[PDB]
């Protein structure tokens, strides 16, 4: 009657809202010829695609937050459950609870134990007596000085198996059809705020899921100024992540060249025990250039007075005191797991825009039975390694805290944070979120019907 | 593919047809790369059987017999496409959106195709 | 949703279109909400893809060129729509049922659409 | 059931329709028996989407405005449907198979709804 | 009944009012919680006071 | 095997059981002792 447009369906039109769904990964289809019997995630790992899509989309304008990122908590989830996958077919180390006899080794105060203790064989008659070597880190004494597994009171144990690695492989995520990822192309970005350029890609670029505490390592580099990231900033309760533009050089080393016993507790199974040291006779180290430190240590510096002011005084210091995986750097090189006392390079004290050798070490301390992300019930041993392991590293980034005890206008000082995987991952995350695809529009036009 | 949702609904008709597409045996990461592929499919069908349903039948565009009510986003026709954005767009029609499907649905393809019966029929 | 049931035919064509339509990690009981909706849409692609290879090519109602056979269910309109319900309806039908199924896709949109594309070429 | 695939194209036609169409509780050999048909319905539905998008809506034959290039297989009609076989024409076409599918959903359904929706207004 | 007559099926009675009934434990119990690791703990019931 | 004797009325339908026990450790078992009600255990 009264005129005159109707109403019309459009299919795909662009509308979407912020949501939440089940991302998988993706390898990039090398990580498969890689081998060594499933490294990490990549088994059945989807192949990326050799072009991947990003779409710029002009003329808008997106609202960012990081900390409300929900990519973060799939892929925390993902490295905890792909962990217990790895660690169920393989072998577990259960009777190895057994007392130990320990003894000193032949400078640096003893640092490692020759346990002697009894064993089961493939037969079930007789047993066996047989001796291996723990790191301090690894056994408790109970009450010769007589030893025992640290894990063996608070949890179980298994074993990793040898064939595979945790060598980090660049993981792609991805979102089912009806979804997008959207990408923040700025150079400079905190998380938080409008994001000017936004482009869309179906997959995330190549992240290594490098798990590590006080130093993101080999992660991705920032643009231009060096950036600084908080959730509540005013908040010392809150860690700061940064993220560096130049990637400072870092060697970790075992400079113990050791052997494998490969002892036979069958039927069917090996275990790997640790034979004797053969070369230098050293505790593990860190190594960082003095040059290359500071000068990002300036230019990060300086980024903190465009929040604590113009002038004034920034000291650094180690970690304040807590578990081992809080207070150290904790990561894994070559299959072994290192704990480096960051303490040297911390020590610190700067001007406004200045502080007050050729090399620099860290000492390093090994401990094979693990529980990271406060597991109980499972704890696994870290297989021995054939020969003196190697690494080198970029160092992208920090977790820090700040101290609570003000004198909140006289100076602040900074220190390693550690504890939560998610910042980790949020390092990476900061410029992506998951929105879903509502194709399905009316508008009204003139065609009506016949 | 997305690249008019910034542009004006005039100018983003012209890509369309961009946006209507894009071992096995594993015990665990095997769901995972099921689960997100298999509610795709099922939000895939949710959408294409009201496409049916309503006085489509067809997909990309379509039209109907429903009339535009003033009282849903009262506008001038230039304001709408040559002026506006689809984001912006259905911001304001979220509150008749519910309305308008019931008209498709019920006030057409029901209506619809039992008028075209009695028509067919002579 | 089925209340015409009971009622004739005749008035049970009203309400037809409301008929239509009404972590996921766990290693068991997530076989078993699965299973029986993967079959739900194994059985609702079923029923679909007859409405497309017969003379329907959409929903609800729609009608053929198939002639309707005196031996089959021979009556009177009225006594079929006014005074007859559906599910006494389909009892007697049970028999011819596969016969008329034939004649959908064979007798018509196999030999429909080739005598369209004949008809189409001038 | 592919029983023309040696005989012409022209006598295959008749046989077309026939191609149409041919506890579970287990932890092992279930994903044996459902990895095979799940990606069937995949494959199902992925020929069937360009079935739509295109000049067709509807299975069998369908036909479109793309008019037939003359580089496309050079011939003469009755050295195409009555001397020669699908599994044989299939074969040149290979190198414009991807060329003719752009001109259906690109050049028609793009370009043909919109110019459907511009002579639907008058 | 499934088969009235026969005295093989057993008779299910439904009520109309609902019957109070009361089922204690009579023993205020401890649990021992000892421990046969690595990382398992059993449940043992302690003296009863 | 379970060592079990009469709790201290209405015929000891509760026995007091001391066995041995494996501990966290393979090498020393552990003597303790748990309660049983009579319908759990079957003397030998
Ligand atoms: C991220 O991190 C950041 C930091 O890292 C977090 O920031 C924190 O945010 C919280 C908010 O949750 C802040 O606490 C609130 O502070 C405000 C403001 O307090 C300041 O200013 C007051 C007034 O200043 C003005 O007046 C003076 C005098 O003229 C003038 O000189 C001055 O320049 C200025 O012009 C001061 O009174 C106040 O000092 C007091 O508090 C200090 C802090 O504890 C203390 O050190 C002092 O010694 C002194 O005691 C301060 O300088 C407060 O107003 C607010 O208080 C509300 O909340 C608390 C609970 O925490 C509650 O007990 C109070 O009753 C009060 O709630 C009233 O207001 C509500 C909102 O209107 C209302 O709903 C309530 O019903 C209630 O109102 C009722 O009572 C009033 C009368 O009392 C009545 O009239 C009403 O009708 C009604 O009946 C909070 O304490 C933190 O300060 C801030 N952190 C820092 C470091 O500053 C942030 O939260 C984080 N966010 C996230 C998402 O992570
Ligand atoms: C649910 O539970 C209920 C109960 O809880 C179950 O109910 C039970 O059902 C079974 C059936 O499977 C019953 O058994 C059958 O009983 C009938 C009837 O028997 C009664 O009546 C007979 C005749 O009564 C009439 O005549 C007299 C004389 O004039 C008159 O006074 C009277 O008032 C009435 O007018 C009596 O002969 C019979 O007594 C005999 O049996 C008693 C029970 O054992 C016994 O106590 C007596 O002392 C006496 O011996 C009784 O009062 C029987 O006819 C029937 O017998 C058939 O089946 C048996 C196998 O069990 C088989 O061996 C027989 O040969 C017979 O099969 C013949 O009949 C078939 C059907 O026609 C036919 O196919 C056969 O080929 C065969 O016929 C052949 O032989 C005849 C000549 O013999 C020949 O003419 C034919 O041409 C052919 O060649 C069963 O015994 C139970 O009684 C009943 N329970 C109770 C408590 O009553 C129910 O099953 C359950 N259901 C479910 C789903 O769970
Ligand atoms: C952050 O990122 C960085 C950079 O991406 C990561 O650094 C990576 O670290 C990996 C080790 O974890 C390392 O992998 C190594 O690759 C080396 C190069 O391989 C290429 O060259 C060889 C030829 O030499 C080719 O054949 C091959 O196909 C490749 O093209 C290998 O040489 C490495 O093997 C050695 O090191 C590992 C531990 O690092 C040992 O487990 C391994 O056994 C090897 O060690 C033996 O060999 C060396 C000499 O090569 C001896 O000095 C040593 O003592 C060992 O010898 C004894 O042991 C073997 C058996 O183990 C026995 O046969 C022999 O007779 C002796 O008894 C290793 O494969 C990556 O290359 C490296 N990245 C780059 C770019 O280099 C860093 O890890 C990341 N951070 C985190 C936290 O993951
Ligand atoms: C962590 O470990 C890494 C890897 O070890 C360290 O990075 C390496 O750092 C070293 C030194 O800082 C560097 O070595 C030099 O590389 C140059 C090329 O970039 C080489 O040209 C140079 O070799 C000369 O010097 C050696 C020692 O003096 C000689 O043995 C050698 O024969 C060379 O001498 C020649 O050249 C001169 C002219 O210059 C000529 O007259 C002579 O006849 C002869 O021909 C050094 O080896 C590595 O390149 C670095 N590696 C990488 C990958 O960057 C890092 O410093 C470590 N970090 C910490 C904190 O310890
Ligand atoms: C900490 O960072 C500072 C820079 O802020 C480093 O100072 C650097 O010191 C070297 C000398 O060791 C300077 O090189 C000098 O260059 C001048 C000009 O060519 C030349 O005249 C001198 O003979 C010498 O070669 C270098 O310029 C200077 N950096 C800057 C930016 O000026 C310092 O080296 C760092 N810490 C350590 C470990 O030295
Ligand atoms: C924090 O870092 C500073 C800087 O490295 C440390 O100062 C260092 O202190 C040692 C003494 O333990 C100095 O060694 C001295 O060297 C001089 C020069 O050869 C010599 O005369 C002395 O006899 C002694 O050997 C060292 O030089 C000095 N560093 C520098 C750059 O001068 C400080 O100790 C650190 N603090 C903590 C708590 O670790
Ligand atoms: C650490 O950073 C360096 C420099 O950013 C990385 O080396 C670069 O690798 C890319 C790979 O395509 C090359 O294009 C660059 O030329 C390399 N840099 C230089 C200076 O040549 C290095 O790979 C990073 N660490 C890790 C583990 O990847
Ligand atoms: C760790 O202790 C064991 C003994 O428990 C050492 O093994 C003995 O080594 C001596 C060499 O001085 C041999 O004579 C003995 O026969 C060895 N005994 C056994 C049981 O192997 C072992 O050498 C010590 N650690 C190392 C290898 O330095
Ligand atoms: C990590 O480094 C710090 C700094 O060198 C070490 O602190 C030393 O602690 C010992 C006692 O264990 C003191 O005798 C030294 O005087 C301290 N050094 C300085 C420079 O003050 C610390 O021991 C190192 N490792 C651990 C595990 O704490
Ligand atoms: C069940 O028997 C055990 C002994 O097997 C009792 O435990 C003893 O209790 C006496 C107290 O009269 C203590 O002096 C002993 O040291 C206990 N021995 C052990 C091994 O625990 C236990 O008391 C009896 N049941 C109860 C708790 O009444
Ligand atoms: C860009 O988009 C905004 C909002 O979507 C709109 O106001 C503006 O007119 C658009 N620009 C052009 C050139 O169409
Ligand atoms: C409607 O659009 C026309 C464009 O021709 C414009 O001149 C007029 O002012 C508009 N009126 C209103 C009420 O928007
Ligand atoms: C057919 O229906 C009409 C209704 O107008 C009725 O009068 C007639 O008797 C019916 N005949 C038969 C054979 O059912
Ligand atoms: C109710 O249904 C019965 C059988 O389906 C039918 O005979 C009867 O006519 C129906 N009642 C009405 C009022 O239509
Ligand atoms: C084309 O077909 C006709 C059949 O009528 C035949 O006579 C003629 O020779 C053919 N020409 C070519 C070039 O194939
Ligand atoms: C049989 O097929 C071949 C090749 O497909 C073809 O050349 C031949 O003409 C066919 N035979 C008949 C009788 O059509």
Redesign the interface.
Same mark, same amino acid.
Request: aromatic content about 10%; overall charge positive.
């Given at each position: 009657?009264?005129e005159?447009?109707?109403?019309?369906?459009?299919?795909?039109?662009?509308?979407?809202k912020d949501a939440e769904?089940?991302?998988?990964?993706a390898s990039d289809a090398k990580a498969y010829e890689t081998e060594k019997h499933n490294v990490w995630?990549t088994?059945?790992?989807?192949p990326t695609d050799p072009n991947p899509?990003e &779409?710029h989309?002009? %003329?808008?304008t997106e609202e960012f937050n990081m900390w409300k990122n929900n990519m973060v908590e799939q892929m925390h989830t993902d490295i905890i459950?792909?962990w217990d996958?790895s660690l169920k077919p393989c072998v577990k180390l *259960?009777?190895l609870?057994?007392?130990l006899q320990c003894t000193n080794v032949t400078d640096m105060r003893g640092e490692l134990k020759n346990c002697s203790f %009894?064993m089961?064989t493939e037969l079930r008659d007789k047993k066996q007596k047989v001796y291996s070597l723990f790191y301090r880190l690894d056994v408790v004494q109970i009450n010769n000085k007589e030893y025992? $597994?640290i894990?063996? %009171? *608070?949890?179980? &144990?298994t074993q990793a198996c040898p064939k595979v690695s945790f060598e980090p492989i660049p993981i792609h995520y991805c979102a089912?059809?009806?979804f997008?990822i959207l990408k923040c192309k700025d150079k400079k970005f905190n998380g938080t705020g409008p994001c000017p350029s936004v482009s *869309?890609v179906?997959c995330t670029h190549g992240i290594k899921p490098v798990v590590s505490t006080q130093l993101l390592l080999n992660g991705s580099l920032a643009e231009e100024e060096v950036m600084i990231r908080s959730e509540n900033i005013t908040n010392n309760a809150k860690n700061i992540l940064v993220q560096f533009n130049t990637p400072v050089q870092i060697n970790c080393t075992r400079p113990n060249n050791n052997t494998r016993k490969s002892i036979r507790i069958g039927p069917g199974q090996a275990f790997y025990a640790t034979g004797d040291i053969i070369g230098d006779i050293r505790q593990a180290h860190c190594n960082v250039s003095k040059a290359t430190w500071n000068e990002t240590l300036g230019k990060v510096v300086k980024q903190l007075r465009k929040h604590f002011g113009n002038n004034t005084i920034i000291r650094f210091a180690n970690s304040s005191g807590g578990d081992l995986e809080v207070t150290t750097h904790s990561f894994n090189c070559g299959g072994e797991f290192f704990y480096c006392n960051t303490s040297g390079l911390f020590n610190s004290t700067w001007i406004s825009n200045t502080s007050v050798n050729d090399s620099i070490t860290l000492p390093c301390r090994i401990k094979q039975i693990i529980n990271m992300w406060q597991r &109980?019930?499972?704890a696994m041993y870290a297989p021995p390694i054939q020969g003196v392991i190697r690494c080198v590293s970029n160092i992208t980034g920090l977790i820090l805290t700040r101290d609570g005890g003000s004198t909140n206008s006289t100076t602040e000082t900074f220190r390693p944070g550690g504890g939560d995987m998610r910042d980790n991952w949020r390092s990476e995350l900061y410029k992506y979120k998951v929105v879903k695809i509502?194709? $399905?529009?009316?508008?009204? *036009?003139?065609?009506?019907?016949? | 593919? +997305?690249?008019?949702?910034?542009?004006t609904?005039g100018a983003?008709?012209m890509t +369309?047809?961009?946006?209507?597409r894009?071992?096995? !045996?594993?015990?665990?990461?095997?769901i !995972?790369?099921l689960?997100? #592929?298999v509610?795709?499919?099922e #939000?895939?069908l949710r959408?294409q059987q009201?496409?049916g349903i /309503?006085?489509?039948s067809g !997909?990309?565009?379509?039209?109907?017999?429903?009339?535009?009510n003033?009282s849903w986003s009262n506008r001038n026709?230039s304001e709408? /496409?040559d002026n506006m954005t689809? +984001?912006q767009?259905?911001k304001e029609?979220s509150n008749y959106?519910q309305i308008?499907y019931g008209? +498709?649905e019920e006030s057409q393809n029901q209506q619809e195709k039992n008028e075209q019966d009695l028509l067919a029929l002579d």
């Open positions: 009657r009264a005159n447009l109707w109403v019309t369906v459009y299919y795909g039109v662009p509308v979407w769904t089940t991302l998988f990964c995630a088994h059945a790992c989807v899509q &779409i989309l002009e %003329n808008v459950s792909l996958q *259960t009777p609870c057994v007392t %009894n089961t025992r $597994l894990n063996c %009171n *608070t949890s179980a &144990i089912p059809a009806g997008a *869309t179906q &109980i019930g499972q509502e194709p $399905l529009g009316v508008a009204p *036009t003139r065609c009506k019907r016949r | 593919f +997305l690249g008019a949702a910034g542009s609904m983003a008709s +369309l047809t961009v946006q209507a894009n071992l096995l !045996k594993l015990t665990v990461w095997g !995972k790369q689960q997100a #592929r509610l795709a499919v #939000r895939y959408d009201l496409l /309503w006085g489509c !997909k990309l565009i379509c039209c109907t017999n429903v009339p535009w003033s026709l709408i /496409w689809w +984001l767009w259905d029609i959106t308008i008209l +498709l």
